[PDB]
Amino acid sequence: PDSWDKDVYPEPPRRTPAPAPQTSLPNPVTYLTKIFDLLVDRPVTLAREFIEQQHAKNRYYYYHREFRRVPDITECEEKDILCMFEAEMQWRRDYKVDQEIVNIIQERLKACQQREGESYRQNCAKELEQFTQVSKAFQDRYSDLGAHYSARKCLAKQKQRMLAERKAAKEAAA
Amino acid sequence: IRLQEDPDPEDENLYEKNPDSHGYDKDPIVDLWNMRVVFFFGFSIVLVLGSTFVAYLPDYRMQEWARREAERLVKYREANGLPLMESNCFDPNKIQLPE
Amino acid sequence: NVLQIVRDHWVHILVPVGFVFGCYLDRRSDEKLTAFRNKSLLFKRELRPNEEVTWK
Amino acid sequence: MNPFASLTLTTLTILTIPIMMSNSNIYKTNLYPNYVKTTVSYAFTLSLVPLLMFMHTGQEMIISNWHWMTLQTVELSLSFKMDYFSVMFIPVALFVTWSIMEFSMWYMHSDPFINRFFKYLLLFLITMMILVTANNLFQLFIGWEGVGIMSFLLIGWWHGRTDANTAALQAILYNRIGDIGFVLSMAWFLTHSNAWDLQQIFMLNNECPNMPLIGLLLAAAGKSAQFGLHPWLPSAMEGPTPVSALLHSSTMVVAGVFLLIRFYPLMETNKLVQTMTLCLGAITTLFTALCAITQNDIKKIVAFSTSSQLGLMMVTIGINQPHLAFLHICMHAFFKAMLFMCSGSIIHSLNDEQDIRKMGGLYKAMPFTTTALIIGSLALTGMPYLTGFYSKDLIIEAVNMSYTNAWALLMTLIATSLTAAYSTRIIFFAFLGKPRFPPLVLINENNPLLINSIKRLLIGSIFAGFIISNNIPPMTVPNTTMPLYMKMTALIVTIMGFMLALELNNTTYYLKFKYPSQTYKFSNMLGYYPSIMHRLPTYHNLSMSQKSASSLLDLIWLETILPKTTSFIQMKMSIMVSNQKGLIKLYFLSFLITIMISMTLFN
Amino acid sequence: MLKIIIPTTMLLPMTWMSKHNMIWINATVHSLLISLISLSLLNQLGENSLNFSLTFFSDSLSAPLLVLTTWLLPLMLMASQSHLSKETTTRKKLYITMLILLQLFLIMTFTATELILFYILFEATLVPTLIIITRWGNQTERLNAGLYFLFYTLAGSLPLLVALVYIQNTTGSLNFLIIHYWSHPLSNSWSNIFMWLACIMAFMVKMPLYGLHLWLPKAHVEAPIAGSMVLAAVLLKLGGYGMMRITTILNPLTNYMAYPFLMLSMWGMIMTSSICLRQTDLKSLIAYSSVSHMALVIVAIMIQTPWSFMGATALMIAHGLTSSMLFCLANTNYERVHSRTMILARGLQTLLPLMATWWLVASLTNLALPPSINLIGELFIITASFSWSNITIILMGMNMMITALYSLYMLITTQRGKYTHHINNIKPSFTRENALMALHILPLLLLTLNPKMILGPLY
Ligand SMILES: CCCCCCCCCCCCCCCCCC(=O)OC[C@H](COP(=O)([O-])OCC(O)COP(=O)([O-])OC[C@@H](COC(=O)CCCCCCCCCCCCCCCCC)OC(=O)CCCCCCCCCCCCCCCCC)OC(=O)CCCCCCCCCCCCCCCCC
Ligand SMILES: CCCCCCCCCCCCCCCCC[C@@H](O)O[C@H](CO[C@H](O)CCCCCCCCCCCCCCC)COP(=O)(O)OCC[N+](C)(C)C
Ligand SMILES: CCCCCCCC/C=C/CCCCCCCC(=O)OC[C@H](COP(=O)(O)OCCN)OC(=O)CCCCCCC/C=C/CCCCCCCC
Ligand SMILES: CCCCCCCC/C=C\CCCCCCCC(=O)OC[C@H](COP(=O)(O)OCCN)OC(=O)CCCCCCC/C=C/CCCCCCCC
């Protein structure tokens, strides 16, 4: 099956060389492939056809839950427990989504390395740069916040980083 | 001697009075039914039913939801040329630095 | 002998009725925390034509 | 789809199948060993098929079927790497295991727990397959510990033997030091790469550092019994001969070499770790061969030969030749398993006698065993066209033409000569001469199981290196040009060892008796390493465990500081407070003093 | 949480109104039913906890502990059946009542939503344990063990009460959600240092910490089998749960005050493993192994990284199950020969094969054989400690080596060798004992199959 997005999970086109034998001996790999197709592939295909026919008898659907956007901890007032709770939940959902984005990029990198094989150091250098950028951004955002991380702690870290950047820019162009 | 004390009794063997003892009780019927209820309830009910219940617990941790959202965001970001991961979690426009 | 069975095995309903009573008390406690029902920013929703409460 | 991954996973599954059937009347009856042997043979054929598939087009695949758990940004999943190393090592291991299982059917016939023995052998095979096909560090560690504990269980097969129990515990200790190294490597890799899988590890580690590579090297040394952690392998011969033939020499002791082969990109990137690997392998092979040349227990001689071959493999890894090490692994598995089977046949025929000083006349007493052992010793020493020629000769040529340690090269050559020497010792003291066994001759090797198993492992000691070397793609540039005296260096040193060992063995027929030398005592006593290193550290650790931690700290000073001192203080204060005599005059005077103090010093 | 709380308070009258020969059957059956009911708490969310009411809430850290307690009660009932054959009906009912009260207090402690109620229940657990030990222990040292246990716990926990009331007066509330959302940094002053010391020292004495741990061998050796099972598996985890809960308000001072406790915990792992190497008593060996594992959990909690809390939770659950199984095996061997000396009885693999298998499996799980949750937790803790510093790897490696050494040493001593000639009362293993061992061991392998349920809220 191909029930996934090709753009999200890229895969280079597959170039398979044509078989050009130079000997009169038969091919045991070809004979064993024919035997495997006759003995395994056809029965499993028939079983899957029956199962999918049974599935189509009663077809029902499930949905992807959509979450609304809420004001964040920057807009939340101090000691405003309800707004802080909403912002914290939104931040945690965003954190999980970012973790899964990093996972997607790592899967891309692993698949590209395995696919390229012996020439990975050069061919799959585009995935390495994307992974470097994503990893650096993820580290800068959710760096060592500890086991009790929170939206307030992340905001404090971002404010500290912004102050450091502003001071560096001023001392450079001043 | 210092007390009028009973001698230490010899330990009783459950297999002497009942070769088919399961070790639960000295009464044969009570022992058999204790073994049966323990085995049935514990093993069958708890192990099998709780294991399949935990296996088929609904995805309330939103792992699959997070994966789908990540796929959607990655597609939208790389389609429009935007960076996959943002530089900041919050908006510097909304953040007011002290100065 | 049916009375003797009841007179000896009536203690086997205590835990089930306790579980039922605990579920009832949990629902009754949940009904006291409906201050923000259908009022959160994330889950605020117009009620269905045949509906009065989003959750019980 | 593709019959590659399906057939590999099918081989693994059919290996796992008889373990499930161990809860049945098939396990209760006496057909279980034959059932397991048949299953292993079918697995061997079904694994030969993907090997044929690979040798055609070089197909390599990884299967990540089951997702175990996602630790935030790190995903651990059940992944298998069906690459060249896996698809080449699985059929060899299955073939050796099939032969060993038939040999064990013949050998452990009177054992009341032969079914359990075969179950343990199958479990070890499953764990070894998991280790070989593992694609991530966690699964590799699972296989590592599985083979370690299966070795522990099978070494102490006779639970009533204190020597077997202590040998098993010693093996566990050395393998646990190796596991310390392995855990260090895993922790470094996760911390500095956010991955436990080889693909991302290789992608991110363009220049692998000393800490992770030293962790890997320590794990490999612990598993392959290199110098410093070697003595567990010779002591692991307390188990049954099938265990020594299958587990240790053939498939388990090559786990460290295989681990170092799996990280050959990182090994190429680093240099200091390569030098350390080369030096460790050289010293290991030299020391183990030197200990072997003077042993009287045939199983111990074969064990030290296995250790020397492992040292040679480590040397091959240190000169940046990972694939030659794998080829040597395969060929060594073949002929070493055959040699162990022949030694076991000799031992069984002579009523559990494991002394070459009592073996003799077996050249004509046991024809087929003699032929098989001669062929195995010729393959072990590098006969110019046997299985050992296509690995050992290339290894020696690559060591000669390399920018390596001169001392390591010299020790490698001396180790080859000593290999020839101890092969000569085994042959001379076991088969030539006059009988020295008890007069009741019970020699009988006409069992079809034994004959067929040794025959199958015998055809693979002649016609397997040629096929394997001619059916693999060139993964390294050959050394075509070299001086003539360097092209035949291995043959010259082998012949020198043959001649010197034969001369020194012929000198034993003279009616001259002389006391042993310091060198002989050093070599026979295993270099004094087991004595000193098994008596001093153990005594000191077990003494400090009782004198300092248990008695001095826990039972004396930790009790003295908090609970005893407080209790004593409270007891003294209670005595002081309640020691009053109940005299109204005294405590009314105390009342007066209290009244005056309250009136004056309180404002 | 009332759906779980009320059935225990119904176990009490059922136990006291059941027939004399049906108390064990009724208690076991209904404890198993309550455990099955409590299995529903594993359906935790991903962002916030389950807030049932203003008083009780469940989290990904609380749920596995509640399930462990509800599962551990019937096993204690089976062990009590084993060792309380000749007791009178009223005393047996009192023993069952003590076990039920302890389970109820543990459930309420794990599900409490405020620190003061948590403290009240966590101190309320002392009374049933002390009564059980000092009343149904077998040897003279049970009174001393009870005194040591009670006074260590109270000396630890009273400054915690003072600190808790001070914190409530200063901030406004002790509710965990409020003190997490309204958390503010702790300045580096003497007053903050002493408040940190109060809270942490209370939970460390409960944990225990090396140097504050003698009460653990004293109480575990002299307690009956059920008392040892509940002391090692659940009561030791109150300190870990409290530390994982109380450290929210102790930052960033925890980054500065953790050094003495980290050094104590690591050197205590080493020292207690070495002590295990040379122990003449099996129960003492198991107790010191428990001390070492809890020291590792302490290290994880003190380094306080997201990879260390998951390892801490997994290791707590795994150690609880493994220690309970080990204590059950040791109690079976003791009840056969009426002595706790380890070298007294040998050849138990020849005499009892299935018990030898159970011993092998328990000792393999103790030394963290992959892919067991013991190893999962230990490996996560080791990786977090390696990130913290690069010599913790050395300490963890030597600790792991010594752990394997003493586990296999006790296995070989008890099971392998030549059987003692003059011990001729080794009867075949009972179905009750075999079922107890199986019920101890199977959940470990099932949690190995599904490990995400015991990795805490940071998963
Ligand atoms: C701290 C030191 C650290 C050293 C590190 C480096 C180590 C280097 C090792 C070198 C090789 C060691 C050989 C084995 C020594 C032990 C022998 C033994 O125990 O035998 C008993 C054992 C039989 O015991 P047994 O039958 O039970 O009965 C025992 C007797 O009852 C009683 O037995 P015994 O005791 O009467 O018989 C032993 C006797 C006889 O054995 C030998 O002679 C063995 C060596 C044979 C000659 C080797 C050199 C000659 C050939 C090469 C010449 C140069 C070629 C250059 C060109 C090459 C390329 C073309 O030897 C001696 O007495 C002394 C031998 C000294 C060897 C040198 C290394 C150790 C020196 C230690 C210092 C003290 C020495 C004095 C002794 C102690 C104090 C009293 O012997 C054997 O099984 C055979 C041993 C000989 C095998 C030789 C194989 C070939 C060796 C390499 C040749 C060169 C290859 C190419 C190299 C690279 C070229 C580029
Ligand atoms: C035979 C030799 C056995 C010993 C050696 C082991 C060798 C390997 C043996 C492997 C056997 C199992 C392989 C096949 C496993 C099939 C089941 C597995 O796939 O499901 C697991 C699930 O298993 C259960 O989750 C385990 C339950 C664990 C909890 C049981 C608790 C019972 C009560 C006891 C209380 C104990 C308290 C302890 C603290 C909690 C994993 O979860 P998942 O694949 O995704 O579920 C799929 C369903 N989906 C798709 C809808 C998600
Ligand atoms: C960092 C972790 C620790 C590293 C190692 C430090 C020393 C280890 C301390 C060991 C503690 C001792 C515990 C005692 C357990 C029981 C001991 C025991 O069973 O007896 C000794 C037992 C068996 O005695 P036998 O010799 O077989 O006698 C049989 C007679 N028929 O032998 C042993 O197991 C002791 C082995 C101790 C190992 C010490 C040597 C290890 C040092 C080498 C490390 C260097 C490796 C070099 C590789 C470097 C690669 C980069
Ligand atoms: C590219 C060309 C080279 C490709 C690689 C070729 C590898 C050739 C390996 C051997 C060929 C395959 C032989 C198939 C044997 C398995 C057949 C089988 O299942 O059993 C039949 C039959 C009887 O088995 P029993 O145990 O006695 O059962 C009796 C039942 N009443 O099996 C046999 O014994 C056949 C005899 C085998 C002859 C000896 C073959 C020795 C082969 C040496 C090299 C093999 C190395 C393995 C792979 C090499 C590459 C890594």
PDB file of C-alpha atoms in Angstrom, chain B residues 60-97:
ATOM      1  CA  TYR B  60      -5.741   9.308  24.513  1.00  0.00           C
ATOM      2  CA  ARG B  61      -2.029  10.214  24.549  1.00  0.00           C
ATOM      3  CA  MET B  62      -2.545  11.668  21.042  1.00  0.00           C
ATOM      4  CA  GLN B  63       0.553  10.010  19.587  1.00  0.00           C
ATOM      5  CA  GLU B  64      -1.131   9.335  16.238  1.00  0.00           C
ATOM      6  CA  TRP B  65      -2.768  12.770  16.358  1.00  0.00           C
ATOM      7  CA  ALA B  66       0.646  14.350  16.926  1.00  0.00           C
ATOM      8  CA  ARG B  67       2.099  12.369  14.020  1.00  0.00           C
ATOM      9  CA  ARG B  68      -0.688  13.495  11.676  1.00  0.00           C
ATOM     10  CA  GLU B  69      -0.326  17.123  12.778  1.00  0.00           C
ATOM     11  CA  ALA B  70       3.438  16.924  12.256  1.00  0.00           C
ATOM     12  CA  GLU B  71       2.932  15.503   8.762  1.00  0.00           C
ATOM     13  CA  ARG B  72       0.480  18.290   7.911  1.00  0.00           C
ATOM     14  CA  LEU B  73       2.803  21.002   9.231  1.00  0.00           C
ATOM     15  CA  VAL B  74       5.831  19.536   7.435  1.00  0.00           C
ATOM     16  CA  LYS B  75       3.905  19.402   4.159  1.00  0.00           C
ATOM     17  CA  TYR B  76       2.687  22.989   4.527  1.00  0.00           C
ATOM     18  CA  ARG B  77       6.119  24.295   5.563  1.00  0.00           C
ATOM     19  CA  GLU B  78       8.155  22.636   2.816  1.00  0.00           C
ATOM     20  CA  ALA B  79       5.506  23.368   0.179  1.00  0.00           C
ATOM     21  CA  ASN B  80       5.767  27.118   0.854  1.00  0.00           C
ATOM     22  CA  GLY B  81       9.527  27.159   1.480  1.00  0.00           C
ATOM     23  CA  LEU B  82       9.184  27.999   5.176  1.00  0.00           C
ATOM     24  CA  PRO B  83      11.613  26.506   7.716  1.00  0.00           C
ATOM     25  CA  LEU B  84      10.380  23.210   9.127  1.00  0.00           C
ATOM     26  CA  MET B  85      11.043  24.287  12.732  1.00  0.00           C
ATOM     27  CA  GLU B  86      10.503  27.864  13.875  1.00  0.00           C
ATOM     28  CA  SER B  87      13.286  29.805  15.566  1.00  0.00           C
ATOM     29  CA  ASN B  88      11.157  30.884  18.546  1.00  0.00           C
ATOM     30  CA  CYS B  89       8.217  29.330  20.368  1.00  0.00           C
ATOM     31  CA  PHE B  90       6.513  32.686  20.993  1.00  0.00           C
ATOM     32  CA  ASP B  91       6.094  35.914  19.058  1.00  0.00           C
ATOM     33  CA  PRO B  92       8.767  38.604  19.598  1.00  0.00           C
ATOM     34  CA  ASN B  93       6.135  41.180  18.631  1.00  0.00           C
ATOM     35  CA  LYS B  94       4.025  40.122  21.620  1.00  0.00           C
ATOM     36  CA  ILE B  95       7.113  39.798  23.844  1.00  0.00           C
ATOM     37  CA  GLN B  96       8.239  43.145  25.283  1.00  0.00           C
ATOM     38  CA  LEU B  97      11.841  43.123  26.474  1.00  0.00           C
TER      39      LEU B  97
END
